[PDB]
Amino acid sequence: AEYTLPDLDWDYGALEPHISGQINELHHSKHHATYVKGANDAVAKLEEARAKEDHSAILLNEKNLAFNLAGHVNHTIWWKNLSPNGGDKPTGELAAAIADAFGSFDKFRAQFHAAATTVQGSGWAALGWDTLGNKLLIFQVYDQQTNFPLGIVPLLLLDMWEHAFYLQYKNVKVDFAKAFWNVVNWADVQSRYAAATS
Template sequence: MHNPRVTKPDNLSTTLEDFVTEYVLPELSYDYAALEPHISARIMELHHSKHHAAYVTGANNALAQLAEAREKGDFANINRLSKDLAFHTGGHVNHSVFWNNLSPDGGDKPEGELAAAIDDAFGSFDAFRAQFTAAALGLQGSGWGFLAYEPIGGNLVIEQLYDQQGNVALGTTPLLMLDMWEHAFYLDYVNVKADYVKAFWNIVNWADVAKRFDGARKNATGLITL
């Protein structure tokens, strides 16, 4: 698939190549139609090639504009640019995790150490799924429901992420993410978000979640200390 690269605004003299590696849209490991009937090919194509691509472009443009501000010594727009960078980079990261969290061969339940950790943290898989579902459906406005690893206590936690970057504890590592922005489900499920969340459980890639859990335990602990 095509990976769109940033188009430098006409008034910028600095390009991303001058100071940083630019973000690119990741390719998917499955076809747009592979997740049907749970998520349609139409939504997948729009979601990946349009919405996610826009976050990539937005993040790259924010980086370029911040570099331009440093070059000119003019930080009059620092609040807007900082927010733009957080929002668009958050959107890029969140979607990149989300695509890998999904698989046409997904569903069922986790196994091994991840399953044991979920049981320890939430009491059972069913209790975990009920809390995750409630968190996703309870979001006010746009955002994400997600399972994360919290490195200070070594705990699994379920969080509500507002927009693309707000309301989450610093340092938590996302393991399983569910996009609750309307563009993720509206063409298939209209306003019946509960049916979308129910369908999501049929395509969860637990192998990917387990890999992220293992990596978080090995690499995140110690990065943030009290």
């Protein structure tokens, strides 16, 4: 049926001071809200293309279908990764996963931070699981749909779009990508991981 904008497991301001409630609202209710509709639209148009056997604009339908389903898919997980009782570090299976995968949790943080802070333009930092080589990796996502292989299982995302922190951190993304760690929903992450390795 249709894609729909999902509910937060918390109150828009749950995250201060690390993330502005202000931001959360706009993000969820505005920006997510949107991808959810483009998503639905593009699908719709393909529906119609095929029904009229006219794929003149195929290039454009695949690009909008890609772009919104993708922002929709990342913003959904972004929410789940966030949490007011989140923070510290991962434990057990995931935590181990991490150190063998990146040496230590700090090693991983580090790279994750670099990943995120150097996107040239819009983008995201993502920890995904490689079913290919059963590895744990970090990709630097450009925009919402580019720069990683098909089949990767997402684990922890961190929105680096300017609308993700400009109201608060302004031009200092560095500060925002730091704050980020203080609300990370490790639980959600650990679940995501278990499932993917299963």
